[PDB]
């Protein structure tokens, strides 16, 4: 990850917290975890840390309000990540299985 040691440390801590929030859903979120960990530029993570944050009110609202649903928002990661093109559909799948999970419970 490019950046100063401070920037890289901040950004990696942001990214690991985010991956943990996604993995607390209880469904396959491996495509999202992979994309988040692919981001190459600490400054891009830091500048977007509040927008990408997967909040704690409730999972449904976190899924619906995530800017990872938007190909337009994700343009900003086109030069410093892998798999951004497919991330909106990944969220579609996650929102499906989550819905199904709530139905199956």
C-alpha positions as a Markdown table, in Angstrom:
| # | Residue | x | y | z |
|---|---|---|---|---|
| 1 | Unk | 0.0 | 0.0 | 0.0 |
| 2 | Unk | 1.5 | 3.3 | -0.9 |
| 3 | Unk | 1.5 | 6.1 | 1.6 |
| 4 | Unk | 3.6 | 7.2 | 4.6 |
| 5 | Unk | 3.9 | 4.9 | 7.5 |
| 6 | Unk | 1.3 | 7.0 | 9.4 |
| 7 | Unk | -1.1 | 7.0 | 6.4 |
| 8 | Unk | -0.6 | 3.3 | 5.7 |
| 9 | Unk | -1.1 | 2.4 | 9.4 |
| 10 | Unk | -4.3 | 4.5 | 9.6 |
| 11 | Unk | -5.7 | 3.1 | 6.3 |
| 12 | Unk | -4.9 | -0.6 | 7.2 |
| 13 | Unk | -6.7 | -0.1 | 10.6 |
| 14 | Unk | -9.7 | 1.4 | 8.8 |
| 15 | Unk | -9.8 | -1.5 | 6.3 |
| 16 | Unk | -9.5 | -4.2 | 8.9 |
| 17 | Unk | -12.3 | -2.6 | 11.0 |
| 18 | Unk | -14.5 | -2.5 | 7.9 |
| 19 | Unk | -13.8 | -6.1 | 6.9 |
| 20 | Unk | -14.7 | -7.1 | 10.5 |
| 21 | Unk | -18.0 | -5.2 | 10.2 |
| 22 | Unk | -18.8 | -7.0 | 6.9 |
| 23 | Unk | -17.8 | -10.4 | 8.4 |
| 24 | Unk | -20.1 | -9.9 | 11.3 |
| 25 | Unk | -23.2 | -10.1 | 9.0 |
| 26 | Unk | -23.0 | -13.9 | 9.0 |
| 27 | Unk | -23.0 | -14.4 | 5.2 |
| 28 | Unk | -20.4 | -14.9 | 2.5 |
| 29 | Unk | -18.7 | -11.5 | 2.1 |
| 30 | Unk | -15.4 | -12.7 | 0.7 |
| 31 | Unk | -15.6 | -10.7 | -2.5 |
| 32 | Unk | -16.1 | -7.5 | -0.4 |
| 33 | Unk | -13.3 | -8.4 | 2.0 |
| 34 | Unk | -11.0 | -9.0 | -0.9 |
| 35 | Unk | -11.8 | -5.8 | -2.6 |
| 36 | Unk | -11.4 | -3.8 | 0.6 |
| 37 | Unk | -8.0 | -5.4 | 1.1 |
| 38 | Unk | -7.0 | -4.7 | -2.5 |
| 39 | Unk | -7.1 | -0.9 | -2.1 |
| 40 | Unk | -3.6 | 0.3 | -2.8 |
| 41 | Unk | -3.5 | 4.0 | -1.9 |
| 42 | Unk | -3.7 | 4.9 | 1.8 |
| 43 | Unk | -4.9 | 8.5 | 1.0 |
| 44 | Unk | -7.9 | 7.2 | -1.0 |
| 45 | Unk | -8.9 | 5.0 | 2.0 |
| 46 | Unk | -8.5 | 7.8 | 4.5 |
| 47 | Unk | -10.3 | 10.4 | 2.5 |
| 48 | Unk | -13.3 | 8.0 | 2.0 |
| 49 | Unk | -13.2 | 6.4 | 5.5 |
| 50 | Unk | -16.5 | 7.9 | 6.6 |
| 51 | Unk | -18.4 | 7.2 | 3.4 |
| 52 | Unk | -17.4 | 3.6 | 3.1 |
| 53 | Unk | -18.0 | 2.9 | 6.8 |
| 54 | Unk | -20.3 | 0.0 | 7.4 |
| 55 | Unk | -22.3 | 1.4 | 10.2 |
| 56 | Unk | -23.8 | -0.2 | 13.4 |
| 57 | Unk | -27.5 | 0.8 | 13.4 |
| 58 | Unk | -28.6 | -2.4 | 11.6 |
| 59 | Unk | -27.4 | -4.7 | 8.9 |
| 60 | Unk | -30.2 | -4.0 | 6.4 |
| 61 | Unk | -29.7 | -0.2 | 6.6 |
| 62 | Unk | -25.9 | -0.6 | 6.4 |
| 63 | Unk | -26.3 | -2.7 | 3.3 |
| 64 | Unk | -28.7 | -0.3 | 1.7 |
| 65 | Unk | -26.8 | 2.9 | 2.5 |
| 66 | Unk | -23.3 | 1.6 | 1.5 |
| 67 | Unk | -21.7 | 3.5 | -1.3 |
| 68 | Unk | -20.3 | 0.2 | -2.5 |
| 69 | Unk | -23.7 | -0.2 | -4.2 |
| 70 | Unk | -22.8 | 2.6 | -6.6 |
| 71 | Unk | -20.6 | 2.1 | -9.8 |
| 72 | Unk | -20.4 | 5.9 | -9.9 |
| 73 | Unk | -18.9 | 6.1 | -6.4 |
| 74 | Unk | -16.6 | 3.2 | -7.0 |
| 75 | Unk | -15.0 | 5.0 | -9.9 |
| 76 | Unk | -12.7 | 6.6 | -7.3 |
| 77 | Unk | -11.1 | 3.2 | -6.7 |
| 78 | Unk | -10.6 | 2.3 | -10.4 |
| 79 | Unk | -6.8 | 3.0 | -10.3 |
| 80 | Unk | -6.0 | 1.5 | -6.9 |
| 81 | Unk | -8.0 | -1.7 | -6.3 |
| 82 | Unk | -9.1 | -5.0 | -7.9 |
| 83 | Unk | -12.6 | -6.1 | -8.7 |
| 84 | Unk | -14.4 | -2.8 | -8.2 |
| 85 | Unk | -16.4 | -3.4 | -11.4 |
| 86 | Unk | -18.1 | -6.4 | -9.8 |
| 87 | Unk | -18.6 | -4.9 | -6.3 |
| 88 | Unk | -22.2 | -3.5 | -6.8 |
| 89 | Unk | -23.3 | -7.0 | -7.9 |
| 90 | Unk | -21.4 | -8.5 | -4.9 |
| 91 | Unk | -23.6 | -6.3 | -2.7 |
| 92 | Unk | -26.7 | -7.5 | -4.5 |
| 93 | Unk | -25.8 | -11.1 | -3.8 |
| 94 | Unk | -25.0 | -10.3 | -0.2 |
| 95 | Unk | -28.3 | -8.5 | 0.3 |
| 96 | Unk | -30.0 | -11.5 | -1.2 |
| 97 | Unk | -28.4 | -14.1 | 1.1 |
| 98 | Unk | -28.9 | -11.9 | 4.1 |
| 99 | Unk | -32.6 | -11.6 | 3.2 |
| 100 | Unk | -32.8 | -15.3 | 2.7 |
| 101 | Unk | -31.0 | -15.8 | 6.0 |
| 102 | Unk | -33.5 | -13.7 | 7.9 |
| 103 | Unk | -36.3 | -15.7 | 6.1 |
| 104 | Unk | -34.7 | -19.0 | 7.1 |
| 105 | Unk | -34.6 | -17.9 | 10.8 |
